Structure formats: structure tokens, C-alpha cells
Amino acid sequence: NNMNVIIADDHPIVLFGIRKSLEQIEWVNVVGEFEDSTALINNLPKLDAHVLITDLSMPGDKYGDGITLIKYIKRHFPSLSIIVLTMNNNPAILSAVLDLDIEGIVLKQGAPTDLPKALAALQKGKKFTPESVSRLLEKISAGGYGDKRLSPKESEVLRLFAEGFLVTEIAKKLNRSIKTISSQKKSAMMKLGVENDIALLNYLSSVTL
Amino acid sequence: MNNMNVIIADDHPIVLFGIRKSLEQIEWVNVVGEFEDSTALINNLPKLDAHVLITDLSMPGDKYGDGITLIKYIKRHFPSLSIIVLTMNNNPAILSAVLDLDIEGIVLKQGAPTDLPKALAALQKGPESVSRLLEKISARLSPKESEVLRLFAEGFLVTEIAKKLNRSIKTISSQKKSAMMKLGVENDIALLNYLSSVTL
Ligand code: BEF
Ligand code: BEF
Ligand SMILES: [Mg+2]
Ligand SMILES: [Mg+2]
Structure with missing residues (x-):
């Protein structure tokens, strides 16, 4: 074959x-x-x-x-x-x-x-790993977050993080408080299993959703 | 030849x-x-x-x-x-x-x-x-600052960046904070976004 x-x-x-x-x-x-x-x-x-x-x-x-x-x-x-x-x-x-x-x-x-x-x-x-x-x-x-997917709110904050905007710019852009944006951001992070901002951007450069 | x-x-x-x-x-x-x-x-x-x-x-x-x-x-x-x-x-x-x-x-x-x-x-x-x-x-930047920035941007933590230069946590952190202010970013996230737009 x-x-x-x-x-x-x-x-x-x-x-x-x-x-x-x-x-x-x-x-x-x-x-x-x-x-x-x-x-x-x-x-x-x-x-x-x-x-x-x-x-x-x-x-x-x-x-x-x-x-x-x-x-x-x-x-x-x-x-x-x-x-x-x-x-x-x-x-x-x-x-x-x-x-x-x-x-x-x-x-x-x-x-x-x-x-x-x-x-x-x-x-x-067969599959070789x-x-x-x-x-x-x-x-x-x-860690145990593999099952979970992003909410529309979470996806919204991350898509703007993916075009290089900061937490304070995203708050103004979406008309949300900094606290809300940060809470949404950290919740999204927990789901994706990324522990810091460099890891998050690298993840975002390989997915555009 | x-x-x-x-x-x-x-x-x-x-x-x-x-x-x-x-x-x-x-x-x-x-x-x-x-x-x-x-x-x-x-x-x-x-x-x-x-x-x-x-x-x-x-x-x-x-x-x-x-x-x-x-x-x-x-x-x-x-x-x-x-x-x-x-x-x-x-x-x-x-x-x-x-x-x-x-x-x-x-x-x-x-x-x-x-x-x-x-x-x-x-x-x-x-x-x-x-x-x-x-x-x-x-x-704009120095070779010592450039290298600290490279290591950070490549995925390495500040901890990991110390051992590859035999410079301490304070010395790599200070050059980073210097380079950040020298470039015009005030933020880790702004630092990667700068690197993207300067890319060849
Ligand atoms: F190694 Be490839 F660019 F993902
Ligand atoms: F600098 Be090599 F391409 F890792
Ligand atoms: Mg490639
Ligand atoms: Mg290599």
C-alpha cells in the first residue's frame, strides 16, 4: 500500500x-x-x-x-x-x-x-504518540478543564486580546468594567489551561475563533 | 574547491x-x-x-x-x-x-x-x-536587553531566563523593565504586540 x-x-x-x-x-x-x-x-x-x-x-x-x-x-x-x-x-x-x-x-x-x-x-x-x-x-x-468551552462573552474578550488590545482598552471597547473583563479573561484562561499571558497569546495565534 | x-x-x-x-x-x-x-x-x-x-x-x-x-x-x-x-x-x-x-x-x-x-x-x-x-x-535597544527580550518572547519564564545568562532574577527583571520602557510598552501583553508589528 x-x-x-x-x-x-x-x-x-x-x-x-x-x-x-x-x-x-x-x-x-x-x-x-x-x-x-x-x-x-x-x-x-x-x-x-x-x-x-x-x-x-x-x-x-x-x-x-x-x-x-x-x-x-x-x-x-x-x-x-x-x-x-x-x-x-x-x-x-x-x-x-x-x-x-x-x-x-x-x-x-x-x-x-x-x-x-x-x-x-x-x-x-494505528496512532503513534x-x-x-x-x-x-x-x-x-x-488539571481537569479539557471538557469546557468558551462562552460568547469570554470569546469576545479573547478575540480582542488576539488583535493586541490591553484589558483597559477592551473594557472601554466592550463598555464593561475592568473587573468584569479581568474575571472573564481569567475564567477563559482556566478553561483553556493557559497559566499566563504569553501562553494565552501563543494559543490565540494558533486559533482564530 | x-x-x-x-x-x-x-x-x-x-x-x-x-x-x-x-x-x-x-x-x-x-x-x-x-x-x-x-x-x-x-x-x-x-x-x-x-x-x-x-x-x-x-x-x-x-x-x-x-x-x-x-x-x-x-x-x-x-x-x-x-x-x-x-x-x-x-x-x-x-x-x-x-x-x-x-x-x-x-x-x-x-x-x-x-x-x-x-x-x-x-x-x-x-x-x-x-x-x-x-x-x-x-x-534603539542594547544587545543585552535584546537577548532578555528574546528569551521572554520565546516562551521562557523569568526564572528560566536567569540560568541561561547567569544573571540573577533581579538583573534580567531590571533589563526587561528598562527595555519595556525603552521600547514604549508598559505591559507584558503590549510587549508581544510590539514584537509582531516590528517583524521582518
Ligand atoms: F512549527 Be510550525 F510553524 F508550527
Ligand atoms: F533560532 Be532557531 F531557528 F531556533
Ligand atoms: Mg511554521
Ligand atoms: Mg531552535
Whole structure:
């Protein structure tokens, strides 16, 4: 069973690496390489791909990147198997990708064999989870907020935080007190499992909802 | 041409794989070692007759650091070594600080796949990559402040930022508060939003 593979990453050095690590796998065929999400979504309908190995952070205004792009691929190419290869190791981001029920997550900070092992497992209709992914996924699992989703109010505050506004600007913009905005903000944070402001913005750069 | 022994360092093994692939074409290149943190790199440099280092900017290593600290350490202890920095960092202040250290090349991970071969060829001729990027920046902060800001913005807590510089919690906190006021932000959140809009 040959597997036709599409690779997507905004760093061409990584694309070369992915091919370099896949050259030893005889049953893998690379039918396309893309560096932004517009080019990827445009070429998906014309290649007959079985698997996508995709990055999370990439350019592309039309279809975006991150969780948004992956959801989009799931809806419109449901038979396509997805493995995410990402440097974005924020537990909240990775738990969000795991929620999408794709065929694997691999970290660029992980082991050199993690990607070929993910593909090997997929050939056997199985899921490979590296330890490096498992560890920080258990942090969010254990804490116990994985089930909960954002309210419209919470989403509203965070969407403006995602365009770089401060708590005092959002209060004025939504016509709410600082106390209310902060309470809404911290409640949203507890749900997403992000413990500080840098973690929150990094989460917000990978989801646009 | 003259044969070059090359050492590669990056905390992402996929990138290390990619660099080998980019250089496998070049007859005169020989890769003599691959390292994923600055401690393994520095420990091994004297044992391998390295001529060129292709190094990442952000990598683990508390002992010799990363970034500017590492490059300075390498310049001082290995003056016969040529250094090419290969990085995803696209902050003008950081890059200008790296380019102040007189390295022999810079390649951005966003740039073309041929840039690395091309930077190697320029090392024989005695760099275009530094110039082009300097002009890209042309068309405020200190190197010590820049590095504190990098570490913070990359995801590292203030605690973690102490050990990579052997500066205390107070000294990194003070340079941060200085750099924040020096840039025009008064807030951690405003600090990341600034970094976005200054990006190359
Ligand atoms: F930019 Be990818 F998510 F490593
Ligand atoms: F982590 Be490197 F600076 F791309
Ligand atoms: Mg990327
Ligand atoms: Mg790195």
C-alpha cells in the first residue's frame, strides 16, 4: 500500500528535512510541497493525496493556519489523514489539535524518528504518540478543564486580546468594567489551561475563533 | 574547491536532517558533527577539526547559553572557526545585534533552500547575506536587553531566563523593565504586540 504524501511548512529547510527523513521509507511518495495555506488548499483538490504532514504556523490570509486550517481540511477533505509536525509545544494548543481527532502529532523539538514512527503507525491504521507529546498532554488532562468551552462573552474578550488590545482598552471597547473583563479573561484562561499571558497569546495565534 | 568540515547545531532534528540534505549535493562539504544543544556543541568542537559552524540561534544549553552569548563564547574560544547563523528569528533588533558580532553568514529559515549552499560558497571567496539583511532592516535597544527580550518572547519564564545568562532574577527583571520602557510598552501583553508589528 503506497501512501501519497503532501508536506506543508513555511520553512523550506524543514521541507527538505521531511523529505530527507522520508527517503528511506519505500512506500511513501511525496506528491506535493507547499509553504503557505492558500497554495496548499488550492493544490489539495488536484493531487490524490492520502496523508498530509502539516505545520501549524504558516502564512495564508484566506484560510489561515493552526487549528482553523486543520478543521477546514477535516470538513472538506475528510478522507485525508493528517499528521501535524510543529514546534508549538504549548499544552493548550496541542490538546486543541488532539481534540480534532487527526492521525498524529509530532514535535519538531522531539526525537528524529518521531515522524517516520507516526507514518509507520498510520500504515498499520494505528496512532503513534511520542512521549514528548504525551507528557504535556497529561498536564491539561490531569488539571481537569479539557471538557469546557468558551462562552460568547469570554470569546469576545479573547478575540480582542488576539488583535493586541490591553484589558483597559477592551473594557472601554466592550463598555464593561475592568473587573468584569479581568474575571472573564481569567475564567477563559482556566478553561483553556493557559497559566499566563504569553501562553494565552501563543494559543490565540494558533486559533482564530 | 577547498574541502570544508562542517558542524551543524539546531534543537530540531528535522532541521538538522534538512541541512544535511541541502549540503549532500556539495562535493567539498563534509559534515563532521550534529548537535541539538550548546553543551554538546561546545564539548565536541575541539575534537572534530571543524572549519565551519552552521548554528541555530535559540537552543537549549544553560552552561554556554544560546543566541548572542553562545556566538560570543564561540568567537573567543574558537577564532579559526567560520560561523553561519541559521535562524527563524525575524526581529530586527535581535538580527542587527547578531550582525554586529562579525559572523561569516546569516541564513533565515523563512528564506530559500539554496541560501545555505550559497553562504558556504561565499566562505571560500572571503558576506553577501549579512549585507542584504542589513539593507532589509534599513528599508534603539542594547544587545543585552535584546537577548532578555528574546528569551521572554520565546516562551521562557523569568526564572528560566536567569540560568541561561547567569544573571540573577533581579538583573534580567531590571533589563526587561528598562527595555519595556525603552521600547514604549508598559505591559507584558503590549510587549508581544510590539514584537509582531516590528517583524521582518
Ligand atoms: F510553524 Be510550525 F508550527 F512549527
Ligand atoms: F531556533 Be532557531 F533560532 F531557528
Ligand atoms: Mg511554521
Ligand atoms: Mg531552535
